[PDB]
Design a protein around this motif. Structure first.
Motif, PDB file in Angstrom:
ATOM      1  N   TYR A  27      -9.682   2.349   7.599  1.00 13.89           N
ATOM      2  CA  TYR A  27      -9.102   2.352   9.030  1.00 13.89           C
ATOM      3  C   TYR A  27      -8.584   0.978   9.446  1.00 13.89           C
ATOM      4  O   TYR A  27      -7.382   0.636  10.009  1.00 13.89           O
ATOM      5  CB  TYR A  27     -10.062   3.022   9.977  1.00 13.89           C
ATOM      6  N   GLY A  28      -9.454   0.065   9.203  1.00 16.50           N
ATOM      7  CA  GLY A  28      -9.203  -1.503   9.734  1.00 16.50           C
ATOM      8  C   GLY A  28      -8.970  -2.219   8.623  1.00 16.50           C
ATOM      9  O   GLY A  28      -9.982  -2.877   7.780  1.00 16.50           O
ATOM     10  N   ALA A  29      -7.636  -2.354   8.348  1.00 15.85           N
ATOM     11  CA  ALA A  29      -7.054  -3.306   7.066  1.00 15.85           C
ATOM     12  C   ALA A  29      -7.092  -4.712   7.339  1.00 15.85           C
ATOM     13  O   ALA A  29      -7.122  -4.885   8.634  1.00 15.85           O
ATOM     14  CB  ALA A  29      -5.692  -2.885   6.713  1.00 15.85           C
ATOM     15  N   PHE A  30      -7.094  -5.623   6.289  1.00 16.05           N
ATOM     16  CA  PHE A  30      -7.017  -7.240   6.615  1.00 16.05           C
ATOM     17  C   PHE A  30      -6.024  -7.628   6.076  1.00 16.05           C
ATOM     18  O   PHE A  30      -5.850  -7.678   4.696  1.00 16.05           O
ATOM     19  CB  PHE A  30      -8.510  -7.574   6.092  1.00 16.05           C
ATOM     20  N   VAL A  31      -5.101  -8.264   6.992  1.00 14.99           N
ATOM     21  CA  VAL A  31      -3.694  -8.755   6.456  1.00 14.99           C
ATOM     22  C   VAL A  31      -3.502 -10.253   6.982  1.00 14.99           C
ATOM     23  O   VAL A  31      -4.569 -10.663   7.769  1.00 14.99           O
ATOM     24  CB  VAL A  31      -2.615  -7.844   7.054  1.00 14.99           C
ATOM     25  N   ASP A  42       0.896  -1.252  -0.016  1.00 13.37           N
ATOM     26  CA  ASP A  42       0.057  -0.054   0.019  1.00 13.37           C
ATOM     27  C   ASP A  42       0.798   1.283  -0.098  1.00 13.37           C
ATOM     28  O   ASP A  42       0.822   2.345  -0.947  1.00 13.37           O
ATOM     29  CB  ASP A  42      -0.996   0.088   1.370  1.00 13.37           C
ATOM     30  N   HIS A  43       1.500   1.371   1.079  1.00 18.75           N
ATOM     31  CA  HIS A  43       2.428   2.536   1.204  1.00 18.75           C
ATOM     32  C   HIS A  43       3.712   2.261   1.907  1.00 18.75           C
ATOM     33  O   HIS A  43       4.767   2.208   1.594  1.00 18.75           O
ATOM     34  CB  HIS A  43       1.769   3.594   1.745  1.00 18.75           C
ATOM     35  N   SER A  44       3.476   2.142   3.509  1.00 17.32           N
ATOM     36  CA  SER A  44       4.564   1.957   4.349  1.00 17.32           C
ATOM     37  C   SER A  44       3.999   1.193   5.454  1.00 17.32           C
ATOM     38  O   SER A  44       2.964   0.770   5.564  1.00 17.32           O
ATOM     39  CB  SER A  44       5.417   3.052   4.634  1.00 17.32           C
ATOM     40  N   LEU A  45       4.994   0.991   6.449  1.00 17.85           N
ATOM     41  CA  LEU A  45       4.716   0.214   7.754  1.00 17.85           C
ATOM     42  C   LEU A  45       3.577   0.933   8.663  1.00 17.85           C
ATOM     43  O   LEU A  45       3.536   2.301   8.510  1.00 17.85           O
ATOM     44  CB  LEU A  45       5.871   0.205   8.647  1.00 17.85           C
ATOM     45  N   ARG A  46       2.596   0.425   9.084  1.00 16.24           N
ATOM     46  CA  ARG A  46       1.592   0.989   9.867  1.00 16.24           C
ATOM     47  C   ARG A  46       1.518   0.381  11.205  1.00 16.24           C
ATOM     48  O   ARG A  46       2.145  -0.529  11.780  1.00 16.24           O
ATOM     49  CB  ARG A  46       0.189   0.498   9.054  1.00 16.24           C
ATOM     50  N   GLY A  48      -7.328  -8.879  11.664  1.00 15.03           N
ATOM     51  CA  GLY A  48      -7.750  -7.516  11.379  1.00 15.03           C
ATOM     52  C   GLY A  48      -6.994  -6.515  12.477  1.00 15.03           C
ATOM     53  O   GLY A  48      -6.906  -6.978  13.666  1.00 15.03           O
ATOM     54  N   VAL A  49      -6.763  -5.413  11.816  1.00 15.84           N
ATOM     55  CA  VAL A  49      -5.918  -4.587  12.618  1.00 15.84           C
ATOM     56  C   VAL A  49      -6.311  -2.907  12.248  1.00 15.84           C
ATOM     57  O   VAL A  49      -6.540  -2.660  10.859  1.00 15.84           O
ATOM     58  CB  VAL A  49      -4.365  -4.550  12.088  1.00 15.84           C
ATOM     59  N   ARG A  50      -6.657  -2.251  12.958  1.00 11.70           N
ATOM     60  CA  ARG A  50      -6.999  -0.867  12.908  1.00 11.70           C
ATOM     61  C   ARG A  50      -5.937   0.358  13.199  1.00 11.70           C
ATOM     62  O   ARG A  50      -5.276   0.087  14.195  1.00 11.70           O
ATOM     63  CB  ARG A  50      -8.299  -0.679  13.743  1.00 11.70           C
ATOM     64  N   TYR A  51      -6.011   1.283  12.378  1.00 13.94           N
ATOM     65  CA  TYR A  51      -4.855   2.211  12.532  1.00 13.94           C
ATOM     66  C   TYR A  51      -5.611   3.524  12.966  1.00 13.94           C
ATOM     67  O   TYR A  51      -6.686   3.686  12.751  1.00 13.94           O
ATOM     68  CB  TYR A  51      -4.280   2.539  11.302  1.00 13.94           C
ATOM     69  N   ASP A  52      -4.683   4.419  13.607  1.00 10.97           N
ATOM     70  CA  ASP A  52      -5.421   5.811  13.934  1.00 10.97           C
ATOM     71  C   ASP A  52      -5.443   6.770  12.631  1.00 10.97           C
ATOM     72  O   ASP A  52      -6.644   7.221  12.819  1.00 10.97           O
ATOM     73  CB  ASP A  52      -4.142   6.581  14.831  1.00 10.97           C
ATOM     74  N   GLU A  53      -4.675   6.715  11.665  1.00 10.84           N
ATOM     75  CA  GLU A  53      -5.052   7.525  10.717  1.00 10.84           C
ATOM     76  C   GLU A  53      -5.431   6.912   9.555  1.00 10.84           C
ATOM     77  O   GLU A  53      -5.656   5.312   9.745  1.00 10.84           O
ATOM     78  CB  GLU A  53      -3.717   7.971   9.965  1.00 10.84           C
ATOM     79  N   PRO A  54      -6.017   7.284   8.374  1.00 13.76           N
ATOM     80  CA  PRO A  54      -6.714   6.511   7.240  1.00 13.76           C
ATOM     81  C   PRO A  54      -5.650   5.847   6.536  1.00 13.76           C
ATOM     82  O   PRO A  54      -5.440   6.293   5.448  1.00 13.76           O
ATOM     83  CB  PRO A  54      -7.199   7.822   6.497  1.00 13.76           C
ATOM     84  N   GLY A  94      -6.365   2.025   6.111  1.00 15.88           N
ATOM     85  CA  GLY A  94      -6.937   0.932   5.936  1.00 15.88           C
ATOM     86  C   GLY A  94      -7.668   0.804   4.682  1.00 15.88           C
ATOM     87  O   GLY A  94      -7.526   1.503   3.694  1.00 15.88           O
ATOM     88  N   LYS A  95      -8.358  -0.639   4.623  1.00 12.21           N
ATOM     89  CA  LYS A  95      -8.954  -0.809   3.235  1.00 12.21           C
ATOM     90  C   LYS A  95     -10.184  -1.187   3.333  1.00 12.21           C
ATOM     91  O   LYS A  95     -11.204  -0.760   2.674  1.00 12.21           O
ATOM     92  CB  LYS A  95      -8.104  -1.717   2.344  1.00 12.21           C
TER      93      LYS A  95
END
Length: 113
Positions: free
Chosen positions: A94-98, A45-49, A68-74, A76-77
């Protein structure tokens, strides 16, 4: 008579030798990562989150195991609910799926908490 809801009896055998011996690497990682702990994720996507574990297990849209992992900033997918199936609670992007192999636990716990 006799209502219906969920069956599938043959699958019980398909997910024993086929979904165990071949998915032993994915299972070992899926049955290790705890839920509710800050962990890193790697993707094109871009870089480490930096997010926290919300859901860990099988999925409906995709086979194998997922995390499932949620991030503070936008960064996610998905938005938690995919194809009707819900995993976590959060907005979109916000909550990407890896995958476990794609996940990296940085602060889970010394033993339990």
């Amino acid at each position: 008579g006799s209502s219906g809801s969920s069956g599938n009896e043959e699958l019980r055998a398909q997910q024993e030798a086929e979904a165990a011996q071949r998915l032993s690497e994915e299972k070992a990682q899926a049955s290790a990562i705890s839920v509710g702990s800050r962990c890193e994720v790697r993707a094109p996507d871009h870089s480490l989150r930096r997010g926290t574990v919300m859901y860990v297990g099988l999925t409906d849209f995709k086979p194998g195991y997922w995390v499932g992992v949620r991030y503070d900033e936008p960064l996610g997918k998905n938005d938690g609910s995919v194809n009707g199936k819900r995993y976590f609670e959060c907005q979109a992007k916000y909550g990407a799926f890896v995958k476990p192999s794609a996940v990296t636990v940085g602060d889970s716990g010394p033993s339990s908490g």
